[model samples]
Target chain A: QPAAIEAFINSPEFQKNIRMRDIEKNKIGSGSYGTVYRLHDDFVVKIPVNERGIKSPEHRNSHPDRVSKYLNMANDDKNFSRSAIMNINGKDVTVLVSKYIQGQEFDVEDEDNYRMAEALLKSRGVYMHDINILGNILVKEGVLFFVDGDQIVLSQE
Target chain B: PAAIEAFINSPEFQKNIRMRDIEKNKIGSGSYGTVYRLHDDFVVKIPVNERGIKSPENSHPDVSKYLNMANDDKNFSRSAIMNINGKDVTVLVSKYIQGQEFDVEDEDNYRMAEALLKSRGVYMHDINILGNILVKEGVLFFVDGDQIVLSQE
Candidate 1:
C-alpha cells in the first residue's frame, strides 16, 4: 500500500494494470494511502486509491500523487500549474516514483533521531510528512532521505 | 505586452492603497491565505483548504513551497505552521514587513525580484496583487512566496 496516497480513486482497469506492472516487484510497504512497489533497484513507485480526497493528513500525502484526478481539468495551473472531484463510485489513482535508498527505516523512538527531526523543524521548518514515517525515511550512512515526497509539507510549528 | 508596464506607467495602485485606511491588525488576505499581524514583526497566515482556491489542493504542497522560498533567498521571509476551518489546514506564522505594495516604479525592485525569481523559476504572475510585493528599508519582499509558479511559459 502507498504510504504516499491522498484520496484519489482510480479506475479498476488502471489499478489492475499497476498490480500487473508491479507484480514482479516486491511491496516495500502499503497503507490506506496506497501501495508502494519496488519499481526498480534505484526507484520505488507509490500508487493510491481514495474515494474522497478529504480528511487525509497533509504530511501523509503529496500533490502530484493526487494530480491524477485533475488530468482532465487544467484549473490546477494556478497554484500547482500542473494538476479533483469528491463523490465517486470508483476513485482516481495515480503513481509516484522516488529514489529508493536501502537503509534503516526511521526510528521514531530513537533519541538521536527524535532530536534530529526536531532540529530540522526548528532550523528549517521542514517536517517530512508521511503516512508511514517508519517506512518512508531511510537512514543511510547517518543521513536521512525520504523515498516518497508525496506527504512532504511545511509546518506552522 | 506585460501588464506590469501599465502598472509602471501609472503606478496608481500604490497610491490607492496608501490613500485607504487599512486595519493594522489584519494586513493581508487572499485566496491562498490570510495574514494577520503578530508580535515581533511577525504575522500568522491562515491558508484555506479549498481545493478550488488556487489549484488542486493548497495545503498539499504549500509547506514545501514555503521552505523552498526561504531556502532560495532571505527576502521571501521564513514561515512555520501550526491548522482549520473552513477545514483542517496549516496556519502559517511568519515575519511581517511594514511596507507598501510592489513599486514597479523602481526599476531596481523589478530587477531584484526578477533576479531571485529566476532561481526559483521566474514568477511571471501575481507580481501585482495587493500586498503581494512589499518595499521595506529599500528592500523588496515577496510576502506570498508560496504562490509562485516556476518555469511558466
Candidate 2:
C-alpha cells in the first residue's frame, strides 16, 4: 500500500521521514538522478533532481528490474542504502540514506582493475554496456558502492 | 556501559540463551532465530545461521523498521555478535511482550504499518510472517525481523 493519510506530509508521524540538506554547503556529489549531501557523519542524503532520470522511489531502488536482489546482495556483503520521504525545495521527495564512504572512483583504465571491471560488468550482465557509463562506482576499503546517483545491475544469475 | 552488541552478545547472554532450566530457556525457534526470555522484561534472539536460508545478520536491530518507529517498549534494547561453532550469530535483545501471532484482515491496521515503515525507507516483505509481527493489548509490534529491503530514492 502507498503512504496513508496518517503519514500525510506534515503530520508528527511523518516528521521522522523528513530529511534536510544544503546543496551549496555539503555539495559532495551530483548526477543524472539527484545530488548528495553529507547530512550526518554515518550517512549521506540524496535529493532527487531529474524525475525523468530515476523515475520513482521504487524505480530509484530498482532501476532496471528485480534490482532488490542486488540491493540486498551488496548490503549483505556490507554497507548500502536506506530511504525516507522528505521535502526538497518545494517538492516532497523520497530522499535516500546510505552509509558515507570516503571513496575514490573505480580506476577502470588500470590493468589490475580493468580485468575485474570486466568481471563486474559481466556479473551485472551489463556487458554490452561499458564501465565508463557507470559514472561513479566507487571503491573504499576494498568495498564497491554505488554513489553519486549511480545504480548497478548485479544479475541474479 | 558497554556497546549494545557487547551487552546483547555478552558472555552471559551466550549462556542464558542456552540455559536448560526452562527446557533450554527457549521461548521460540524455527523461523530464523531462537528466542529466549533472558529477563522478565527482555528477550534475547540468536538468529540461526542456516545454510540454505539467509544472512542472519539481517535480523539485527539496526535494520529494524518497526523498532525504529514503534512507540512501544518493543524497542531494541541492544544487539551483539556471538560466535557459536564457526558461525557469527547476530544476537538481539528487546522487549518480551507476552502476545500471540496476529493475523487479521484489516487493511487500515496493516497498511498503516506499511506506510509508517516506508516513511523511514524500509521495505519489509516478511511482515505477514507470523513471527515478525505480534499483537498485544490491541496493538501490533513488529519483531524478529530477518528479511528486509532497505531501498532508497
Candidate 3:
C-alpha cells in the first residue's frame, strides 16, 4: 500500500524529518560537503563549493552515462528512493534530506562511546579512510545515526 | 617605604600598600601597568613595562617625563607621578579626572572618537576609544595622554 502524505508526515521519523528541515535554515554545520546549512531541521541543504563539487570534465562524463544508470535503479517509487526526493519551490535539486537524529555528535571524550562509534562505522560499509575528526555520528536517545556519508567510498579491495 | 614582593603577589591588594603611602586610588588601570585598590581611598599603578631600567636602583624615564610634563606643561601637568620599589620597581601614579568614562553602556562612541583624533592631525591610531574618553555633563573628553609617532591600530 502506498503511504499517503498525512501518514508519511505523521510517522515519528518523518516528523523529525520535518522539524530538522525547519532548524537547518538557522543552524550551521561544517562538513566535507562545504558547510551544510539546514533547509529544515531534517533536510540538510549541502551547497558544494570550491573543490567539493564534481570536476567539470568528470561531471560531464558521469551524467547521462554513469550517474544516469545508477539514478534509474535508485529512482523507483519505493520508500528509500521516494523519501529522499522532495519538491522545494518546484526546483528539482539533489539535496539529501534525511531523518533527523536528535542527539549531539558522539563525544570522543567518552572513550567507550567513541570506540563503539568507530566499530559501528566500520560495519556500515565504511573504510578507515573515511573516518575524520569532523565526521559526526550522532546518537539520539540510544539510537545511533550516521549523519555524514559523502566521504564514504566503497573500498576497492 | 615599599610593599614587599610577597604581599604584592599574594592577591591581597588591600594590605599591599600602607595608608600613608597611598596617594589617590581610582584611576582604573592602564594597559601597561597594574593598578591597585588600597585603603585610605588611593589608586596606585605599578609600572611593569617601563623602559630605561638596567640596574636594581635604575630610574624610570616615564616618571621624569610625566613629572616634567605635569610641572612645565599646563595641558598635561595635572597627572601625579611617584616611585616605589617592593617586588619590582614601579613609578606609581594617579590622575584626578572625576566622572564616568561612558554615558551609554553599549553605545559606539569609538567612531566619533576616531574621527575627532584624526581631525587633530595626528597620524597615530588616535586612541582606542575603549580607554580614551570621559562622559561629563553630556560631553565627551579625550583622556589618552600617551603620545606616539605612529600607531597601526
Q: In model 2, what is the error at residue A135, expressed in angstroms?
A: 50
Task: Extract clashing residue pairs from model 2.
Answer: A83-B121, B5-B79
Better of 1 and 3 by lDDT: 1
- Which docking class does model 2 fall in? incorrect
Angstrom error at residue A135, model 1? 21
Put down candidate 3 lDDT per residue, B1-97, tens digits, no spaces: 1222223334544233442354354334444655555433333555543231322332343454444343343232112333343333444433323
TM-score to native of every candidate shown: 0.26, 0.29, 0.23
RMSD of each: 24.0, 22.7, 22.5
Q: Largest DockQ belongs to which candidate?
A: 1
**Best candidate according to lDDT:** 2
Report interface Cα RMSD per prediction.
17.1, 16.9, 22.6
Q: How far does residue B133 in candidate 3 sit from its true spot (Å)?
A: 86
lDDT of 3 at B12: 45
Give the Å shift of residue A151 in candidate 1: 14
Tens digit of per-residue lDDT, candidate 2, span B45-149: 666522324343245555444564453323456555555555666666776678866443554455555554565665534334434556799897766554433
For residue A81, model 2's alpha carbon misses the true position, in angstroms, by 58
B62-118 in candidate 1: lDDT tens per residue?
454554464464433333333232233444544456767886556656555555566
- Residue A6 displacement in candidate 2 (angstroms): 49
